[PDB]
């Protein structure tokens, strides 16, 4: 059968002791699911796994599949589940500097004091917009980091500094 989608919410980059949801998705109606952790004998028989706190031991490669009648699906793409905050942060610099003219070149530089051989560079994504903001029938899609701004309706393009972040965590079905 065709592959389902395996997704980590809010992120596949989970800090130690912070929650995350692994959601498998095949065609709707579908009932029978298997989450597999590669290079281990660990697995779950559910579309959705809430991890209430991340651990070194839960980091790794996961795939999932589904069953219709006598036939299993092709496995999903590998989800790489990463535990972050295991080690002291590196330092990140721009050479020649953080301000560069259009058409120019720049090299970003990651350095640790400690004996570490691998590095990954991420660019922050664009925030997405949604008093009181009710959410009815929440999903793991709604898990994430929220900030709010305040402003006058009379000067509607002059906004506050953003609120301290608020982590919204959608646990599993009760």
């Amino acid at each position: 059968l065709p592959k389902p989608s395996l997704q980590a919410l809010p992120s596949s980059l989970v800090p130690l002791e912070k929650p995350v949801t692994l959601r498998c998705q095949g065609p709707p109606g579908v009932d029978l699911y298997r989450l597999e952790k590669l290079s281990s004998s660990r697995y779950q028989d559910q579309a959705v796994l809430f991890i209430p706190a991340m651990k070194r031991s839960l980091a790794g490669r996961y795939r999932c599949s589904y069953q219709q009648g006598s036939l299993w699906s092709l496995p999903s793409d590998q989800l790489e589940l990463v535990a972050t905050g295991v080690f002291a942060k590196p330092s990140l610099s721009a050479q020649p500097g953080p301000a560069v003219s259009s058409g120019g070149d720049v090299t970003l530089q990651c350095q640790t004091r400690y004996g570490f051989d691998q590095f990954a560079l991420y660019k922050e994504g664009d925030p997405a917009p949604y008093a009181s903001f009710p959410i009815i029938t929440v999903t793991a899609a709604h898990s994430g980091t929220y900030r709010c701004y305040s402003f006058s309706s009379r000067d509607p393009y002059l906004w506050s500094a953003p609120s301290d972040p608020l982590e919204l965590v959608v646990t599993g079905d009760p």
Epitope: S40, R42, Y43, Q44, L49, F50, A53, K55, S57, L58
Partner: nanobody, 126 residues
Framework: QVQLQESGGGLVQPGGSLRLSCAAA????????IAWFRQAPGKEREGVSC????????YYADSVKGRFTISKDNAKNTMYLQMNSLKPEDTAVYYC???????????????????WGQGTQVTVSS
């Protein structure tokens, strides 16, 4: 971040009986693998009993088969180790472990468990 809240442990006579427990908070054991491990003085951490999968098959180390019982109460969100007929060699720190993942491993091994009790001392003495 999650809670394994520990109860029981202590000094007991050879042939005596103790119940250890770990009470979850931040999660439930309903769809979790559960295990007890132990570390005697001058030994390695050994698996004592687990329920690895939903089939509710229980493994027991050879040395505790017929004396120890692992169980779960999804009403109290508590896991148990009932220890009967205790022997000097049962003296150890005991650790409840749980995973949101099931395992097909037939023996209980550290790699399969993510959430750990701080430790519960059991001492057996005549």
């Amino acid at each position: 971040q999650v809670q394994l809240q520990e109860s029981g442990g202590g000094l007991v006579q050879p042939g005596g009986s103790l119940r250890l427990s770990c009470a979850a908070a931040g999660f439930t054991f309903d769809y979790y693998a559960i295990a007890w491990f132990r570390q005697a003085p001058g030994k390695e951490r050994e698996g004592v009993s687990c329920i690895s999968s939903s089939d509710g098959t229980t493994y027991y180390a050879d040395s505790v088969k017929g004396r120890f019982t692992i169980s779960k109460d999804n009403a109290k969100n508590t896991m148990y180790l009932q220890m009967n007929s205790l022997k000097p060699e049962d003296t150890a720190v005991y650790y409840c472990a749980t995973s949101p993942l099931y395992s097909t491993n037939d023996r209980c091994i550290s790699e399969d468990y993510d959430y750990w009790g701080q430790g519960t001392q059991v001492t057996v003495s005549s």
